[PDB]
Amino acid sequence: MKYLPQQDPQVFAAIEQERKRQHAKIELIASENFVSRAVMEAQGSVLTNKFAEGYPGRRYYGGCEYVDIVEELARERAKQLFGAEHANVQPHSGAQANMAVYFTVLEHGDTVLGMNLSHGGHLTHGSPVNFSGVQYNFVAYGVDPETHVIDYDDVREKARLHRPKLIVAAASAYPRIIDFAKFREIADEVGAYLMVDMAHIAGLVAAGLHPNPVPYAHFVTTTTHKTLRGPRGGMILCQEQFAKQIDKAIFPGIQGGPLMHVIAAKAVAFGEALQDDFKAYAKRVVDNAKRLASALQNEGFTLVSGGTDNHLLLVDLRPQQLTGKTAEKVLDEVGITVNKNTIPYDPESPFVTSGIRIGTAAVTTRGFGLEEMDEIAAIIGLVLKNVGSEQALEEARQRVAALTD
Amino acid sequence: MKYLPQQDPQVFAAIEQERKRQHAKIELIASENFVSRAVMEAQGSVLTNKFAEGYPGRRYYGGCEYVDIVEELARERAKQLFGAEHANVQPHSGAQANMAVYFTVLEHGDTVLGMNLSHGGHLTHGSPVNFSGVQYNFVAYGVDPETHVIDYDDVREKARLHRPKLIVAAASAYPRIIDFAKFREIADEVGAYLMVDMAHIAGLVAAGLHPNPVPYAHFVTTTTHKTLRGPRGGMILCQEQFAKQIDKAIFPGIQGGPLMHVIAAKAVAFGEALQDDFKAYAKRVVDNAKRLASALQNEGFTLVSGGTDNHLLLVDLRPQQLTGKTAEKVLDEVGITVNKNTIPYDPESPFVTSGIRIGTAAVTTRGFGLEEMDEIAAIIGLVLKNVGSEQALEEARQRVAALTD
């Protein structure tokens, strides 16, 4: 940076602390990642100066010839990546992508069926304090109490009983592969649309490491950040038949001007994901998650669903008589960043929880491999088995420092 | 840029075309501006990597100590700038800021009173193709057919007849000062909340060149771009009594994670606006608009409301028997960027229009002054009085080039 340090010492100092924090800590929050310098440069471009309401070649303002190229590159690369017939790369966030799909197919009060929030579903999949649960009538399907795998007979029964107009699949804390084919079969049985929110797994889908929802869902929403490793933002994918309606939902429906600099950054991120080395990266993410899962089990931890098929895992801390809140706090003390997370059938509130959620996308981006997974698990074991020992915590702190250098 | 040119030749080439376009053209779109290099650097920072759901000191994820400093700097500087008791700097856009206020005080189907869209009101103030008009029952007040000034007796009559729960004031194409005191008086008479959408005029308000809505409105929404000259995004200001509810509307109500890099950029922009030289800038914006208005009248153009009190003006093209669409197209041919705009009581559709809207914020940022205003008006006169003369258009093109260098 050249101009910020001189113009705004306070903001620069805080940014610099954050940069140094990102390097020093072990980031295990499952949605987190580190974008490339090219992605950041795109976001820091003069494209922030351009008003571009509308779509490429169909703008409501002049001078968009070049930002049109940028947006079309984003859309075409997204289509290549996911085999979708249409992309909308304007959503400001995953929340806004979801909001737009809901706005397209639902009327106020319509019934929607989504994953139980305390079993891994997202806030925007029907929380009563979120617009989704306030605007629409959400019902929930659950995971099996033993296997923690989505109960597809429960999905079907809920669908048949409640007759939702829309079924939502996908999750913020579900460590196994989702069967999109079964979701579409159930949707077809009850005449519901299927929306898949692939935010967490989008990078894995792009790398062919998780089944692609595109062939099965009427609408697929996603973040551009997370495993896809792009800038913060949203995207919607759909078949040509819904394209006009989806685009109209985003604008003039729910947003105004798009963030063209962020859209440039999306294009960059999609370009990266199209490369062979991104595929290799994504495989290491999943390999690392499996290794970390195995190593945590070796430490004596119980994992929700007994392991992982993807980038993330959930530790059920009940056997150690710890809450997620307690575990999250003490790991913070040693430089490991996780989040408390409800586990299926959690006896604790979502503000306390019986679990921690862990993901490997961020550490994999930093070049961590299988050995590092073994060591991260050993440190977590050391810490959580010795919550009252400052000497143990200091040892952990030194081991974390050894990992981040 | 260092990394983007190597990583993504296609995206870089398009960005570079856009950069060169921004310099070559005369930007007169009233919402447009050019941000500082410091603002762009903040947006291009590693803060895009940080998940920060919640608010400073009350986050739902760990590691936010430094992004908390950044967000608090944004909020405190906004409060200083506008004399507001509370700021929410998380809205992704002006649309989302509006959406959140609506979500806070309204139920589905509630009546809202806003400015007539064809008299200068915004899409999010009740368009039937926007969420605002679909979710809530919007009624409209108008401007006087002669003076083009808001008819406050019409505001009052509409309020008394329709009994709105909320009254919205503010506009995208209104060239005169809005009387927030009268809006609040009317609101009080009918027991309605008052929301002011100051997006267009926020920079002028910060510089003390337009009356401040904060003392009069329960809620003030704004963009951070436009006359405020910040990054693209939204903000809400309100009294302490609404703070908790407003914050809850943004999250978990309508958004998820905030864009922390954009919030850093907002802080930077607010820092700039707090400086004396921003006040001088804003005065030049308004001085330039008045000069341009006068010079356009000297050319024989009729202006909506007969002039301007702010950064923008509207040309009523009926005396020249031109549509806004025709004028916008031919000015595009010579390198002047305007937008067609409906004028009050326009006999044309919003897709054709009888007007063009012009603003001086962008050219003022580039250092244009009164002489340049005179020349811009003379070029517009040359072009619009000679739409069929390629020689005139080539002369205009050369004069535009002389201005941008």
- Report the CATH number that the domain containing residue A264 is assigned in CATH: 3.40.640.10
Q: How are strands ordered across the β-sheet holding A312-316? A: A302-303, A312-316, A355-359, A339-341
- What is the helix (H) or strand (E) element at residue A314, kind and residue range? strand A312-316
Q: Which residue of B has its CA nearest to A328?
A: B62
A60 and A186 fall within a common domain: yes
**CA distances from residue A405 to A24, A34, A397 in whole angstroms, order as listed:** 8, 17, 12
Number of domains chain B is built from: 2
Task: Give the length of chain A.
Answer: 405
Å between B155 CA and nearest CA of chain A: 26
A181 and A128 fall within a common domain: yes
From the list B34, B36, B339, the residue facing A61 with the nearest CB is: B339
Q: Which residues make Cβ contacts (< 8 Å) with residue B18, sequence separation at least 6?
A: A46, A47, A50, A66, A67, A70
Q: Given an 8 Å threshold on Cβ–Cβ distance, is B38 in contact with A7?
A: yes
Q: Given an 8 Å threshold on Cβ–Cβ distance, is A62 in contact with B339?
A: yes
Q: Which residue of A has its CA nearest to B275?
A: A7
B247 and B159 fall within a common domain: yes
Pick the last residue of a domain from B256, B283, B310: B283
Å between A200 CA and nearest CA of chain B: 13
B229 and B82 fall within a common domain: yes
Q: Given an 8 Å threshold on Cβ–Cβ distance, is B130 in contact with A253?
A: yes
Helix residue ranges per DSSP H, A252-342: 260-273, 276-298, 324-334
Å between B189 CA and nearest CA of chain A: 30
The answer to whether residue B351 neighbours chain A at the CB level (below 8 Å) is: no
A158 and A259 fall within a common domain: yes
Q: What is the resolution of this structure in A?
A: 1.7
Helix, strand, coil share (%) of chain B residues, nearest 5:
50, 15, 35
φ, ψ of residue A234 to 5 degrees: the values are -120, 175
Which residues, numbered 290 to 349 in chain B, qualify as contacts with chain A under a Cβ-Cβ cut-off of 8 Å? 328, 332, 337-339
Q: Comparing C-alpha atoms, which of B42, B198, B51 is closest to residue B122?
A: B198
What six digits make up the tokens of A53?
């309401």
Å between B329 CA and nearest CA of chain A: 9
The answer to whether residue A26 neighbours chain B at the CB level (below 8 Å) is: no
Q: Which residue of B has its CA nearest to A36?
A: B3
Pick the last residue of a domain from B266, B283, B300: B283
Chains A, B: CB contacts within 8 A come to 261
B192 and B254 fall within a common domain: yes
Q: Given an 8 Å threshold on Cβ–Cβ distance, is A95 in contact with B11?
A: no
Experimental method: X-ray
Helix residue ranges per DSSP H, A144-193: 152-162, 180-190
From the list B22, B44, B131, the residue facing A41 with the nearest CB is: B44
Pick the last residue of a domain from A249, A283, A317: A283
A102 and A172 fall within a common domain: yes
Q: Comparing C-alpha atoms, which of A365, A371, A383 is closest to residue A27?
A: A365
Q: Given an 8 Å threshold on Cβ–Cβ distance, is B7 in contact with A93?
A: no
The CATH number linked to A290 is 3.90.1150.10
The answer to whether residue A152 neighbours chain B at the CB level (below 8 Å) is: no
- What is the helix (H) or strand (E) element at residue B280, kind and residue range? helix B276-298
Q: Given an 8 Å threshold on Cβ–Cβ distance, is B253 in contact with A22?
A: no
B277 and B393 fall within a common domain: no
Alpha carbon dihedral B149, B154, B159, B160, in 10-degree steps, equals 150
B137 and B238 fall within a common domain: yes
Which residues, numbered 88 to 107 in chain A, qualify as contacts with chain B under a Cβ-Cβ cut-off of 8 Å? 92-96, 99, 103
Q: Which residues pair with A391 in a beta bridge?
A: none
**Owning domain of residue B115:** 33-283
**Would you say B201 and B83 are in contact if contact means Cβ atoms under 8 Å apart?**
no
What is the Cα–Cα distance from B188 to B285, expressed in whole angstroms? 34
Q: Given an 8 Å threshold on Cβ–Cβ distance, is B38 in contact with A65?
A: no
- Residue bearing tokens 């050391």: A382
A43 and A75 fall within a common domain: yes
| Helix A9-24 × helix A390-404 angle, to 10° | 100
A145 and A89 fall within a common domain: yes
What six digits make up the tokens of A265?
């950054």
A161 and A24 fall within a common domain: no
Q: Given an 8 Å threshold on Cβ–Cβ distance, is B44 in contact with A47?
A: no
Q: Which of B92, B98, B106 to mutate to test the interface with A (most CBs of A within 10 A)?
A: B92
B-chain CB neighbours of A17 within 8 Å are 65-66, 69
Beta strands B355-359 and B312-316 are antiparallel
Q: Comparing C-alpha atoms, which of B267, B43, B44, B41 is closest to residue A4?
A: B41
Q: Which residues make Cβ contacts (< 8 Å) with residue B366, sequence separation at least 6?
A: B34
